[PDB]
Amino acid sequence: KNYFNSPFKGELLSEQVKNPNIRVGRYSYYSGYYHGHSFDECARYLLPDREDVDKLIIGSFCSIGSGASFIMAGNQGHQHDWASSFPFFYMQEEPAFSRALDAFQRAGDTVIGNDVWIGSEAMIMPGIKIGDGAVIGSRSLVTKDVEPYAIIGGNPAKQIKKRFSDEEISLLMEMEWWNWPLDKIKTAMPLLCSSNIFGLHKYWREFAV
Amino acid sequence: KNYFNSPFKGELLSEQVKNPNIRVGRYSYYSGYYHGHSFDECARYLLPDREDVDKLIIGSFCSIGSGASFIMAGNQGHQHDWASSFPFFYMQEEPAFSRALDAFQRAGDTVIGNDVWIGSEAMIMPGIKIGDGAVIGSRSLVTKDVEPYAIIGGNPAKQIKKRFSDEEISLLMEMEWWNWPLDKIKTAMPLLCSSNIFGLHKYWREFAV
Amino acid sequence: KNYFNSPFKGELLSEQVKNPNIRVGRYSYYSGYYHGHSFDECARYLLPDREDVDKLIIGSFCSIGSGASFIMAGNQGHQHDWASSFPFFYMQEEPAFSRALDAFQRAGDTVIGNDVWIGSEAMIMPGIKIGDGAVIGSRSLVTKDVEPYAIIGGNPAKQIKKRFSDEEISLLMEMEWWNWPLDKIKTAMPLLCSSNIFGLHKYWREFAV
Ligand SMILES: O=C(N[C@H](CO)[C@H](O)c1ccc([N+](=O)[O-])cc1)C(Cl)Cl
Ligand SMILES: O=C(N[C@H](CO)[C@H](O)c1ccc([N+](=O)[O-])cc1)C(Cl)Cl
Ligand SMILES: O=C(N[C@H](CO)[C@H](O)c1ccc([N+](=O)[O-])cc1)C(Cl)Cl
Ligand SMILES: O=C(N[C@H](CO)[C@H](O)c1ccc([N+](=O)[O-])cc1)C(Cl)Cl
Ligand SMILES: O=C(N[C@H](CO)[C@H](O)c1ccc([N+](=O)[O-])cc1)C(Cl)Cl
Ligand SMILES: O=C(N[C@H](CO)[C@H](O)c1ccc([N+](=O)[O-])cc1)C(Cl)Cl
Ligand SMILES: O=C(N[C@H](CO)[C@H](O)c1ccc([N+](=O)[O-])cc1)C(Cl)Cl
Ligand SMILES: O=C(N[C@H](CO)[C@H](O)c1ccc([N+](=O)[O-])cc1)C(Cl)Cl
Ligand SMILES: O=C(N[C@H](CO)[C@H](O)c1ccc([N+](=O)[O-])cc1)C(Cl)Cl
Ligand SMILES: O=C(N[C@H](CO)[C@H](O)c1ccc([N+](=O)[O-])cc1)C(Cl)Cl
Ligand SMILES: O=C(N[C@H](CO)[C@H](O)c1ccc([N+](=O)[O-])cc1)C(Cl)Cl
Ligand SMILES: O=C(N[C@H](CO)[C@H](O)c1ccc([N+](=O)[O-])cc1)C(Cl)Cl
DSSP states (O other), rough: OOSSTTOOEEEEEEHHHHTEEEOOOOEEEEGGGGGSOOOGGGETTSSOSSSSOOOOOOOOOOOEEEEEEEEEEEEEETTTTOOOOOGGGTTSSSSSTTTTOOOOOOOOEEESSSSSSOOOOEOTTTTTEETTTTTTTOOOEEEEEEOTTEETTTTEEEEEEEOOOOOHHHHHHHGGGSOOEEEEEEHHHHHTTOHHHHHHHHHHHHHHH | OOOOTTOOOOHHHHHHHHOOEEETTTTTTOOOOOOOOOOOOOOOESSSSSSSSOEEEEOOSEEEOOOOOEEESSTOOTTSSOOSOOGGGOOTSSSGGGOOOOOOOOOEEOOOOOSSOOOOTOOEEETEETTOOOOOTTTTTEEBBOOOOOOOOOOTTTEEEEESOOOHHHHHHOOOOGSSSSSHHHHHHHHTSOOHOOOHHHHHHHOOO | OOOOOOOTTTTTHHHOOOTTTTTEOOEEEEEEEGGGGHHHHEEOOSSSSSSSSEEEOOSSOOOOOOOOOOESSTTTOTTTTOOSOOGGGGGGGSSTTTTTOOOOOOOOOOOEOOOOOOTOOEEEEEEOOOOOEEEOTOOOEOOOOOOTTTTEETTEEEEESSSSOOOHHHHHHHOOOEEEEEEEHHHHHHHHSSSSSHHHEEEEEEHOO
């Protein structure tokens, strides 16, 4: 049964996420009608029962399209530098594999910043960091860390351009509007819904003491 | 429940399409067994209830493989040139967002020509025009308009080659066999099932007055 | 209903495969929780009822991730070198198409070697041969044959690197550990779970008469 009533509406990550090893920021949402499942299944292979695994961390004011996925569990027990990539350690039904060593290796957390737009069916590899403000094109295969405000696409994903000038990006990284009190975001809404980064920064300087 | 009985058979677009904002030509079909849904769900985010949206237009004698998708609704309410890509205007459950502006922007219709082969899990971005005779490889991410008779593939999709010489393409674009009366298509079937473009054009000149 | 109980466990190919035109080696498995179906549906368009079609052959000690697919049935009745790519021969419901010729062309078997790791949602095109020891990255679109021990990724897929030196690859191709009696694999398990290719080859020379 589809978790979603409509392709024209998602649901807050904070409302649907049940895996303890996913941490999500305010207002971020997943719109998953075309793939049926809620967001937890987007975090593939993420054990929910222990601290000693790579975690998935998502910032605030993120938009995540249908069927995006975040590949967890590191190398999933496969070490291609070993003679075989086959996970003998994980097939203990076979007594002949009893002397196997565990190939599992962590990749580090997957960290998605604030104000990140993730297109439908993008797939983020293990251990990837995505900076604030990035745009991940639909169907991107994200194999490398993504700089703040980068627009990327492709398989493998490559940076196409940045959303703003370096000077504007510096202003945004300084003001961190995604952490403002809600009443300031409410007041700033006309500027947030605009290309006027300099004006948004001017408001930040006005209210921030 | 799967809309399709078999992976070895599709169904005519004209028989399955119910969205009023999808227009389809004769004999074009969708073979969707491996993704379950009928063709309407291939047109993602396509509002069915109004005239003032981008429409999906598909020509005649097109073949569409399983899970191909056509991304509609323009930018879906996200403007990356604005300070935030987050669609505040669409989260009016939050009163703090009441002053938001609508970021929505149309992309233009998605237009698929005649005699177009679309491979399984190709994904066509908003506003894309695909010329007559094109071949869209499986898993293509189509980010730019496609020339008539181009064979393309990849993510992002790139033109690999064309199906015919420029001279042969000129003959095909002149004769427009996909608009012939059915009795002419019936008579031309041996030539249509052949590489004899010059002969097909000769038949067109014979019957077209 | 999901064929799989868990994303953390697959099932042996030998246990789940029912299509007579799929041949699989020992211990190879498919972990398909995120796409629901058992492995047979991974082999798209593979007729089960006759000898005169391209077959899917998979070696031993292969690991196949969720939603990987192997596109069978050659050109599926579409010949882009003909005037139309539309499969008139397959729409005999329309009497006007009765003079159509069958465009179907075989591509040759799809052959996956031993000790091959196939990432989730990789898609292998018709007729492709993948050498022993290869690693197929997640979401690869595999359009060309893959050399033994190549690590590939992308759409279209490209070779990134090889797993071992040419000298080490030569040792592995000579010893063919994937065909050893199980008692030798059991004894060699510490070396198989290691980067010590030279030591594994030394054990092979010790026991092989
Ligand atoms: O969920 C939301 N938007 C997503 C797009 O990110 C939703 O799927 C959607 C798509 C299209 C659209 N439209 O055509 O205006 C509106 C919402 C907002 Cl309601 Cl928060
Ligand atoms: O036991 C579990 N996971 C273990 C680590 O505790 C690991 O992922 C695993 C998977 C399969 C397996 N096996 O085939 O027996 C053993 C451990 C469950 Cl919590 Cl998924
Ligand atoms: O994913 C893409 N486009 C989507 C289609 O749903 C749409 O055009 C879009 C692109 C960017 C965006 N953003 O920068 O926030 C929002 C929607 C391309 Cl960037 Cl690959
Ligand atoms: O406009 C500004 N301040 C005015 C008073 O000069 C007021 O405080 C204000 C701030 C923000 C705003 N907004 O984000 O829409 C509107 C008015 C600064 Cl951005 Cl210069
Ligand atoms: O639907 C049709 N063909 C699609 C391929 O575009 C169908 O999925 C199919 C696939 C393979 C095939 N074969 O092996 O001959 C026949 C039909 C025709 Cl019946 Cl109109
Ligand atoms: O009301 C609808 N769509 C509106 C435009 O009329 C637009 O897509 C939309 C989506 C979500 C929304 N919201 O969160 O309240 C508001 C409008 C339904 Cl027809 Cl999908
Ligand atoms: O999609 C592709 N191949 C499909 C696999 O189902 C098949 O080989 C095919 C290719 C082209 C085609 N056509 O030009 O009409 C028909 C089938 C490659 Cl072109 Cl990426
Ligand atoms: O073959 C041709 N005309 C013959 C008579 O000369 C006849 O009219 C015809 C036309 C088309 C055809 N076909 O498409 O198979 C067969 C015969 C022209 Cl293509 Cl030169
Ligand atoms: O099926 C198996 N492994 C696959 C990975 O190839 C399974 O999906 C899996 C994934 C992650 C994992 N982990 O976190 O350790 C264990 C098994 C082994 Cl149990 Cl044979
Ligand atoms: O009859 C079958 N397949 C035939 C070859 O025997 C071929 O794939 C096919 C598909 C569709 C079709 N049709 O539309 O009538 C005819 C043959 C079934 Cl076994 Cl799938
Ligand atoms: O598919 C990939 N990574 C997977 C994510 O599940 C994982 O990092 C992995 C990569 C290689 C591998 N191997 O060489 O056997 C095993 C797991 C990249 Cl190689 Cl594209
Ligand atoms: O270690 C070796 N032989 C020892 C005796 O010298 C013994 O036969 C053995 C072989 C393999 C092995 N293993 O794969 O772990 C352990 C001991 C050869 Cl690899 Cl040099």
